[PDB]
């Protein structure tokens, strides 16, 4: 769902489709601000991989010999060809072109600039009952700006009573290589007045893997789970 | 520059005679976009089960197709041949002149 | 007088192509190809010619590997040869009576390249694309040997067998049939007299409006159109001044009428 | 030889209302569908409605289309507005006889520390921080 890679290396995106009503399969690239376009399509009946318009031949290849488990590998990555990548195929009726899930691909110059989040719970207003309370955790200092976040109070997943800031806002907007942050503002009066209620707001961060090289003096930002802890008082 | 409009010609194999079966031929010639919607119309409705010839081209590499169907004409029925094509702003309809 | 094979490769989109192969003897068609079964469909009993039952299979295998390899070099060379979607490719090849062998190719309706003697030659007007296309076609020398073998040797020895076995169907004679009718008026105080003729074979005919023995020279003879049964059709019109027209007739001469002209006399009521 | 674009980039409408999204297309075809798609914030893409050429006006469930084929315009009219259906939307177009790739528009987006229930955040009671 999320892949991070450096410039000049290779990347393989695996996309999924509902069972297979598959004839020819197409790949589309989506970039925020611009319009999505098709890069290439794969004809499995003859293993034909033809590009489109002014696309550099050999840059993109596809070999997934399965209706639902199909792969596309893009090579010699640059800082430009980064975005969401979809797989699509038409219906049996050819009336609707069904699309896949989509893999978010981000590319950076050096294998640094990636860092895990900094999630912690803050102190709300002292008014509180004077009959509601709102505890919030902020995840900041993480790049790329694609993480998952939940609350997990009392050892149970949260479902309702929370709206999460969908678009993470970059801490330093001038240089487009810094980190971003997002909020998770989320309770009744009697719940937090009870000093036995636990909040373990957690963030799932996507990063590198074991096969990735690491040279910086800090820790390698592998896919991690960073969580905070908080409780309540009586006065 | 290299988009040619088809020539549509409508004719009957046999003289028109109410109650007797006959054949209606529509002939599209002289086009090179090469993809076209030829339809025969009976009182406005699209006629189904219309057979054609295998597509081919002439010396100037211009494409011609023959489309035909059997039918029994009446006094109140009027027929036409409708053509939709790249080089056409609207579908061109050619009627069958019966005296 | 000539037998030729045509090939129509239409690339409507990157993932949409349709190639049609057909074998024609002048106007009428005699063979067809079916990629579903990769076999040659003979359209007439005599359309097999004087060829062996074996080398017909050897030809249909040579065709299927040739049509499948050819129809796939395009879209691999689509960017290469600067072919713009959508586009069309057309090819004609055959031989004539008594014995010139021809083979020509068309891209986007215009003459692109041609095959002469034993090589692919570009048309000078076609530009530099044809030169590139000629070079890629001139690359493998076995194919051009195989092509030249077909055009020089197989085509004449086949057309001789085809015309011989088709003698009963080539010089068969079908009598015409005519009916007169009204046409769109060409103006005010003017009528249009139309003389339809249909059902004749072969194409050579003679049709003209008449006044006694004076051929009315204002006779507008139309095109000869097919009728899906081997016969033809032709309408001849004539414009008159709303009068001095009730004495007009349409005369038809054909090689099947055995010297008895069909004559129809205008009524106008 | 085709182009598809959308004018507005981000709008907002009251809950339980009716809103529309226009789309302009310059096409040289006589047989084609144009579709509307829904891009969720999680990048998921969902089909919405299918119409085009001479195919009446498509109302396939709680959503209609204003079809101006003479002026080459299509507007996706979504009535009985749901607060849930708040995502991005993209306008696509493709050939009828030979279905192949689609040409899309630019998209139409639809919508210590102290919170007023350095950072700016966004709103989603109001929970902006």
Residue numbers in the entry:
A (entry chain C): 11 to 140, 143 to 198, 200 to 248
B (entry chain B): 1 to 99
C (entry chain A): 8 to 105, 110 to 280
D (entry chain D): 2 to 112, 136 to 141, 157 to 163, 174 to 178
The authors write:
The crystal structures of three Vγ4Vδ1 TCR-CD1a-lipid complexes reveal that the γδ TCR binds at the extreme far side and parallel to the long axis of the β-sheet floor of CD1a’s antigen-binding cleft.
To generate the CO3 γδ TCR-CD1a crystal structure, we used CD1a protein carrying heterogenous human embryonic kidney (HEK) cell-derived endogenous lipids (CD1a-endo) and were not able to unambiguously model lipid antigen in the CD1a cleft. As shown by the SPR data, the resulting hybrid TCR bound human CD1a-endo with an affinity value (KD = 19 ± 0.3 μM) comparable to ‘wild-type’ CO3 γδ TCR (KD = 23.6 ± 3.1 μM). The crystal structure at the CO3 γδ TCR-CD1a interface was unambiguous, permitting a detailed analysis of the intermolecular contacts. The CO3 and CO22 γδ TCRs bound CD1a-endo with dissociation constant (KD) of 23.6 ± 3.1 μM and 15.5 ± 0.5 μM, respectively. The three ternary structures were very similar, so the structural analyses, unless explicitly stated, focus on the highest resolution structure, CO3 γδ TCR-CD1a-sulfatide.
